[PDB]
Amino acid sequence: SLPATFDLTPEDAQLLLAANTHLGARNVQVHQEPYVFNARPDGVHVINVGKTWEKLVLAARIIAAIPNPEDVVAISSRTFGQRAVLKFAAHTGATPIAGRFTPGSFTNYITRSFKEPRLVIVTDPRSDAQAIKEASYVNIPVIALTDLDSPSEFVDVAIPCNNRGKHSIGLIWYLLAREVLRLRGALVDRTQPWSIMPDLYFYRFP
Amino acid sequence: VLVQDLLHPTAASEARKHKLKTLVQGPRSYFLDVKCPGCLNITTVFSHAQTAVTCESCSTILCTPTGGKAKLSEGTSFRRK
Amino acid sequence: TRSSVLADALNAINNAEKTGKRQVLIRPSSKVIIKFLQVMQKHGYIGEFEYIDDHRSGKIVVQLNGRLNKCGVISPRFNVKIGDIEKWTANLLPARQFGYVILTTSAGIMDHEEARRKHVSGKILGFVY
Amino acid sequence: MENDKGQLVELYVPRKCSATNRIIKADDHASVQINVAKVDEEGRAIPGEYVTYALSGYVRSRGESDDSLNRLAQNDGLLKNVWSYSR
Amino acid sequence: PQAKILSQAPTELELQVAQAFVELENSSPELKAELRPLQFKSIREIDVAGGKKALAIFVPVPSLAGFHKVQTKLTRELEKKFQDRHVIFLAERRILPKPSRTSRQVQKRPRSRTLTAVHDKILEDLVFPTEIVGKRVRYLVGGNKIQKVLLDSKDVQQIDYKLESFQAVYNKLTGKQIVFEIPS
Amino acid sequence: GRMHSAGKGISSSAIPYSRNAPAWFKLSSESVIEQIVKYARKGLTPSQIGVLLRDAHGVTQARVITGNKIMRILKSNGLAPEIPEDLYYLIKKAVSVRKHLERNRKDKDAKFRLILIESRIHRLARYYRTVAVLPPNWKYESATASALVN
RNA sequence: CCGGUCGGAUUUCCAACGGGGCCUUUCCUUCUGGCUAACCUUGAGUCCUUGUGGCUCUUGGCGAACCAGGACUUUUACUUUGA
């Protein structure tokens, strides 16, 4: 129930294999074993990219199904993501969170940072679980950017990535940000490429 | 996993389980058709055979037994069953 | 060592439906396992099942819906008279309008309403709700 | 539940889960419910239509949530070739 | 040649296959010795779902190994001789009943005459010369119960077109349902 | 789980599924039933026969190629031993520890590994007496250790 | 369902729920006597379209209900109904 315009473009995957985002970590856990294509003799495992795109259009079919586009929240605490969340939330309208999450900010409405979202999008739920654990109290669905060392508790639809590279963290926000606009009607045609350079979403320090 | 087809398991994982604990158990041994250069005759032989056999005519050693599987001798050929 | 086959053929079920699975694997099968199962299947508590055979005593693979709270076994199979079903049934079962205790009775293995209108009695076997 | 005359006499019938057919009570505060968006022939999204999934409190805590999404979604034609029965 | 191959069975429709028996016999000089000393008890005819019929031969019991050495190269000879048929080779077993509690004691019946020990053999001859590698019995929701027979994967090209006819004869003799299934 | 021990391993042969001959057998039942008796005259157990038959002449199981078991064949041809084979091996094991004891006396240990070996013989002997393949006055003793086989 | 009515009939059909019966390679295991009804045998009485029609008369084959001699046949536990 999604036509051939929703299929994987051969030009699109040319980016991903260039971006080195199909190299999982060297220790699978027991829940993410469907996502592994084959092991390399070096010691690394190769993610199935045709799976990581098939569970990429699904998240955008959830993000587009919300009334108010400021009820999505996108969080990072690593340095590598906390530019990419901002330009995501810039021209979509989500309420970004970068740097430090303060504890007790989805409960305890006497704080000034109090929020009551409809989704939560996290990057690295190993070193981020305070937003995971608090969302469990108040019926908040969640979407993650899962590696193969990722504790996948409380986490619904789960984009398989490589959370070690710098392009590969940024790019998955970009393709997600590209796709969410196409569903809204804010663009014109699926087949035309995105005018913005994808290097904008990266991170750089002098 | 919570939902799994237990009745039609994949053949790539059945090869790794123990001899007993597959769906319906069975052997993982076989039989060989070994030949000696001299007598040029055939003799069937077990794979993990635990006695050192010899040909009935060319009284020459064929398979030394040890461990878990028999090691064949040199200067000979074989073929499965 | 292994004394009752049925007693841990129903311990394998609810031990893997408290964790919300959908299928289990029983080993060995029996003539009295299958008929205990065939009375939890004409009432809806389980789905369908298949019988392997491997020339020794087969295994079974059962499909579970969502509807069992507990199924069990009573291990000295005592001797229920006919005035004494309703004291066994006021103790084992959660409410007066559902659930069943099943019996081995001289005209087959059946539940306790089915044994009322045939007017028989026998030895106890287990319960289901 | 309904009396001799016929009318329902509960307070109000509660929501079954969709992965394990349990029952979700008024203090299951991790009981997520998730909508996805139907699509248009041009490739756009209808703003008013959904497909709804309800997941219990404890299929999430063990971590079996996302696979239970892929199992549930793929029966409704949302995905193809990402989940496999015969594991 | 006419009353030979039967055993007190005057009926023309196998007398002609007895006539068909000697016609291949005398034209087989290297075989007519070993095709000679056999017999068969009786025969029966039944219709299949392929818009045609089929034949079932009944042979006296210890001659089964005698028939099996020649079983292939006489089978299709009647198939080209008589049309729209399928010939099946079955033995002829005997089933003693089960002694109830209040019954007069007779000699104790050996296992080879028990009702579940004939039918599992009555499959095995019927699918000659390929082998069964496993079975399953399936227990449905509507109180009905069908089975499933895993066959081998070598000579099945000789037999694959008869699998619908096989469900006819086994249903008629017993009252059971069989779905043949060949894995790879 | 190993009577008179505390080990728990499991390692047997696993009998294959088919109850018929393999397709790579090219002999007769008559041309193989007599190699059994041809080695019985050599004075062998059933146990040594089958392993010698399998590793040399390719018979997987005499149970399926001939209609009977080995001991049934040997009983029909009168080559059967008197005492049943397993019971005899516990006896011969019991004298070799006994013969060690006439040369050793400061072994408190292997004294109490003989009362274990002897204990498995009364277990075996009750069963053989009850099924009546031993006459109901068969008894084992230290004097009958050095009498019936020795 | 049907009420049909100067609650009870139901012409009449349906769903279940328990019970017989035969047939399927397959249950009391028989015997000798009466013995009663019943199919039939040499064959008509009986009265109805005329009958070796049955009903039933006569010889004669029997299964068929009941008494009487049997005739032989592993043994318990439990449960149902009776005195």
Curated annotation (Swiss-Prot), chain B:
Pfam families: Ribosomal_S27e (PF01667). Coiled coil: none annotated. Binds 1 zinc ion per subunit. GO terms for cellular component: cytoplasm; cytosol; cytosolic small ribosomal subunit. The N-terminus is not modified. It is found in: Cytoplasm. It comes from the Eukaryota. Component of the small ribosomal subunit (SSU). Mature yeast ribosomes consist of a small (40S) and a large (60S) subunit. The 40S small subunit contains 1 molecule of ribosomal RNA (18S rRNA) and 33 different proteins (encoded by 57 genes). The large 60S subunit contains 3 rRNA molecules (25S, 5.8S and 5S rRNA) and 46 different proteins (encoded by 81 genes). Belongs to the eukaryotic ribosomal protein eS27 family. This is Small ribosomal subunit protein eS27A. It comes from Saccharomyces cerevisiae (strain ATCC 204508 / S288c). The lineage of its organism: Eukaryota, Fungi, Dikarya, Ascomycota, Saccharomycotina. The gene is RPS27A.
Curated annotation (Swiss-Prot), chain D:
InterPro entries: Ribosomal_eS21, Ribosomal_eS21_CS, Ribosomal_eS21_sf. One of its GO terms (molecular function) is structural constituent of ribosome. The keyword Ribosomal protein applies. Its main location: cytoplasm. Disruption phenotype: Reduction in growth rate, a decrease in free 40S subunits, an increase in the amount of free 60S subunits and a decrease in polysome size. N-terminally acetylated by acetyltransferase NatB. The modification N-acetylmethionine is found at M1. It is found in: Cytoplasm. It comes from the Eukaryota. Transmembrane segments: none annotated. Keywords: Acetylation, Cytoplasm, Ribonucleoprotein, Ribosomal protein, rRNA processing. Component of the ribosome, a large ribonucleoprotein complex responsible for the synthesis of proteins in the cell. The small ribosomal subunit (SSU) binds messenger RNAs (mRNAs) and translates the encoded message by selecting cognate aminoacyl-transfer RNA (tRNA) molecules. The large subunit (LSU) contains the ribosomal catalytic site termed the peptidyl transferase center (PTC), which catalyzes the formation of peptide bonds, thereby polymerizing the amino acids delivered by tRNAs into a polypeptide chain. Belongs to the eukaryotic ribosomal protein eS21 family. Present with 27400 molecules/cell in log phase SD medium. There are 2 genes for eS21 in yeast. This is Small ribosomal subunit protein eS21A. The gene is RPS21A.
From Swiss-Prot, chain E:
Pfam families: Ribosomal_S7e. GO terms for biological process: cytoplasmic translation; ribosomal small subunit biogenesis; ribosome biogenesis; rRNA processing. InterPro entries: Ribosomal_eS7, Ribosomal_eS7_CS. Present with 41000 molecules/cell in log phase SD medium. There are 2 genes for eS7 in yeast. The gene is RPS7A. It comes from Saccharomyces cerevisiae (strain ATCC 204508 / S288c). The keyword Cytoplasm applies. Belongs to the eukaryotic ribosomal protein eS7 family. GO terms for molecular function: structural constituent of ribosome. The keyword rRNA-binding does not apply. This is Small ribosomal subunit protein eS7A. Keywords: Acetylation, Cytoplasm, Isopeptide bond, Nucleus, Ribonucleoprotein, Ribosomal protein, Ribosome biogenesis, rRNA processing, Ubl conjugation. There is a cross-link at K80, K81, K121 (Glycyl lysine isopeptide (Lys-Gly) (interchain with G-Cter in ubiquitin)). N-terminally acetylated by acetyltransferase NatA. Ubiquitinated at Lys-80 and Lys-81 in response to stalled ribosomes, leading to activation of the No-Go Decay (NGD) pathway: first monoubiquitinated by MOT2/NOT4, followed by formation by HEL2 of 'Lys-63'-linked polyubiquitin chains on monoubiquitin. GO terms for cellular component: 90S preribosome; cytosol; cytosolic small ribosomal subunit; nucleolus; nucleoplasm; small-subunit processome.
From Swiss-Prot, chain F:
One of its GO terms (biological process) is maturation of SSU-rRNA from tricistronic rRNA transcript (SSU-rRNA, 5.8S rRNA, LSU-rRNA). GO terms for cellular component: 90S preribosome; cytoplasm; cytosol; cytosolic small ribosomal subunit; nucleolus. PROSITE patterns: RIBOSOMAL_S15. The modification Phosphoserine is found at S31. It is found in: Cytoplasm. Keywords: Cytoplasm, Isopeptide bond, Phosphoprotein, Ribonucleoprotein, Ribosomal protein, Ubl conjugation. SMART domains: Ribosomal_S13_N, Ribosomal_S15. There is a cross-link at K38, K42 (Glycyl lysine isopeptide (Lys-Gly) (interchain with G-Cter in ubiquitin)). GO terms for molecular function: small ribosomal subunit rRNA binding; structural constituent of ribosome. Component of the small ribosomal subunit (SSU). Mature yeast ribosomes consist of a small (40S) and a large (60S) subunit. The 40S small subunit contains 1 molecule of ribosomal RNA (18S rRNA) and 33 different proteins (encoded by 57 genes). The large 60S subunit contains 3 rRNA molecules (25S, 5.8S and 5S rRNA) and 46 different proteins (encoded by 81 genes). Belongs to the universal ribosomal protein uS15 family. HAMAP family: Ribosomal_uS15_A. This is Small ribosomal subunit protein uS15. It comes from Saccharomyces cerevisiae (strain ATCC 204508 / S288c) (Baker's yeast).
